[PDB]
C-alpha cells in the first residue's frame, strides 16, 4: 500500500496476494531507482517462492516492469551503479547462520 502524508490518502498498489511466512516475508519493497520509482521484490508471478524477482512499480500498480536481475531482497543505486542484495533479509530464527543461502551483495 501507498500512504501519502500530504492528504492522508491510503491506497493498495499490489493485488498479487503474495504468499508469506514468518521467515520469508516476501513481496516487499526492494528499493528506489534514480528516478524515484519504487522497485519491489515479489515471487507472485514466479514458479518458486525463493524467486523474489525485482519489479519497477508504475502508475500506482497499473503495470510492473521486470528488471530481470534475478532474485533479490534489496536493490541500491550508487553512482549510477546497481547494488544487489541477495537473501539479505533478517534471520532472527537462526543466529550464526553460515549456510549457502546467507546474505550476499553484488555490484
Ligand X SMILES: N=C(N)NCCC[C@H](NC(=O)C(=O)[C@@H](CC1CCCCC1)NC(=O)OCc1ccccc1)C(=O)N[C@@H](CCC(=O)O)C(=O)N[C@@H](CC1CCCCC1)C(=O)O
What does 79 bind: ligand X, a copy of itself, none (CB cut-off 5 to 8 Å by kind)?
none
Q: How far apart are CA 93 and CA 34, in angstroms?
A: 34
* Calpha distance 54→39 (Å, rounded): 7
Q: State yes or no: residue 99 binds a copy of itself (CB under 8 A).
A: no
Shortest distance, CB of residue 39 to ligand X, whole angstroms? 23
Count, residues in the chain? 107
Q: What is the per-residue binding string for a copy of itself in 6-45, x denoting contact by CB under 8 A?
A: xxxxxxx---------------------------------
DSSP 59: G
Which of a copy of itself, ligand X, none interacts with 49 (beta carbon under 5 to 8 A by kind)?
Answer: ligand X
- The string of DSSP codes covering 4-56 is ETTTTEEE----------SS---SEEEEE-TTS-EEEEE-TTSSSTT--EEEE
The binder of 20, among ligand X, a copy of itself, none, by C-beta within 5 to 8 A per type, is none
Q: Which spans of this chain sit near a copy of itself (rule: CB under 8 A)?
A: 6-12
Amino acid at each position: 500500500y501507498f500512504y501519502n502524508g500530504e492528504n492522508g490518502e491510503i491506497k493498495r498498489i499490489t493485488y498479487f496476494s503474495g504468499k508469506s511466512t514468518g521467515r520469508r516475508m516476501f513481496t516487499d519493497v526492494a528499493g528506489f531507482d534514480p528516478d524515484g520509482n519504487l522497485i519491489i521484490s515479489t515471487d507472485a508471478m514466479q514458479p518458486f517462492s525463493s524467486m523474489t524477482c525485482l519489479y519497477r512499480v508504475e502508475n500506482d500498480g497499473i503495470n510492473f516492469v521486470p528488471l530481470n536481475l534475478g532474485p533479490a531482497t534489496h536493490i541500491l543505486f550508487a553512482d549510477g551503479r546497481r547494488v544487489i542484495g541477495r537473501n539479505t533479509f533478517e534471520l532472527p530464527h537462526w543466529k550464526g547462520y553460515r549456510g549457502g543461502t546467507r546474505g550476499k551483495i553484488w555490484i
